[PDB]
Amino acid sequence: SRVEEEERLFRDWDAMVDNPAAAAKLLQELQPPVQQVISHCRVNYRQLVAADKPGLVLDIAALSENDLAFYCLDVTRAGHNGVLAALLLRALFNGLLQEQLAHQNQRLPELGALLKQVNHLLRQANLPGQFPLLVGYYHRELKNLILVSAGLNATLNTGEHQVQISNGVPLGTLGNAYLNQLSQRCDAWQCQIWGTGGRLRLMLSAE
Amino acid sequence: SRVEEEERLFRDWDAMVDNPAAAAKLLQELQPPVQQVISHCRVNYRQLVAADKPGLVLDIAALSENDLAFYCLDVTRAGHNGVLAALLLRALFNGLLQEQLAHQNQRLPELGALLKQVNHLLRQANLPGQFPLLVGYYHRELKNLILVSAGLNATLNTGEHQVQISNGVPLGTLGNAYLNQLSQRCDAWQCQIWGTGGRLRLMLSAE
């Protein structure tokens, strides 16, 4: 179905660019389930206010049997272009990170470099605006969590460790390098992400 | 004088182990100046309450012409052993990090590995207790700041980015790996560190 969702995102893209209602409706239908198992990890997601319109959106998916990645985007800053950016990320984000790891001999993710690539992708898709974005990577065996924020606020709790991040440089500008990085080793974590568009909660545990 | 201070720390160590008043008096005299230039960086330090007794102590020094490192230790958790640990770190911390970089082909610091080494050093110096410690690295040309906390709270402000960290695992236990890491690229930053023992402020700018 994720494979099938990728085909509808590719085939219907032009129709979604010209129909904001349809694009927003599909974006709401593509939200993660409340709980799932990804790469031997329990993953729980919920918006902290029950709403019908997309504000802060999230996607999370496996990169291999043993690691996963996620992105979180505030679509309200760029309006329709923000919704389209979320749909574009849903189609290509995981594949872009998988390609970068395929060129890294030890599969050590460079989320800052990925954000630079996403910035270029948004330009080449003709999606101007500002896109507050948070990207994360987790490996179930190494127990390593990596977080990079570009314009979003976030709290990370691992029990022994607590971090609050508030980055003010969203994606969408020409020459910003996004190099803040939080790396944390943990077996479980709870993360809350928020911006103007809303606030969500994402938690992870071993299966 | 820093070279000369290293010789008195080595020669008088045994006398300081047996005289807590002398050890604490020397520790207070070894605090950083209010402002200095280290590795082409302005460095400003102040305790946020004017006090005579050591609580949260800091040292910062160059690793080369272009980078520097610092540590911050709450000496009140282990009492006299905490004061001694600070004196031991003042003597050896910079040299230990310089040796680690000499074995890394690109001089990429591993502050988590350094903390593991410091934990072993405290054991071999026969200094039991708990030692809340924060270590930092900054490179003036790459503009990269790295922070790792083991039991201390800290806020980092770079203008575009703000981070609050509160780690609960101080040094002194047997088998803790210390792997939280904040990496941030910035030209200037202001950092406030605190624990039970007190609170200090450290800021950096280009010279």
Numbering used by the authors:
A (entry chain A), B (entry chain A): 102 to 308
The authors write:
The RssBC domain structure is a mixed α/β-fold with five α-helices and 11 β-strands and can be further divided into a mediator/connector domain (residues 131–163) connecting RssBN with RssBC and the actual C-terminal protein phosphatase (PP2C) domain (residues 164–337). The α8-helix connects the mediating α-helical elements with the C-proximal and structurally conserved phosphatase domain, which consists of 11 β-strands and two α-helices. Indeed, the effector domain of RssB exhibits a PPM/PP2C phosphatase fold, however it lacks the active site residues. The conserved residues (between EcRssB and PaRssB) are mostly located in the hydrophobic interface but also include two positively charged surface exposed patches, one of which is centered around the putative phosphatase site that corresponds to the peptides 90 and 91 from the peptide library and hence may play a role in docking to the ZBD of ClpX. Based on our peptide library analysis we propose that the ZBD of ClpX interacts with the α10 helix of RssB.
RssB is a response regulator (RR), and as such is composed of an N-terminal receiver (REC) domain and a C-terminal output domain (also known as an effector domain). In contrast to most RRs (which contain a DNA binding domain) RssB is linked to a protein binding domain, and as such represents one of the small groups of RRs (~1% of all RRs).
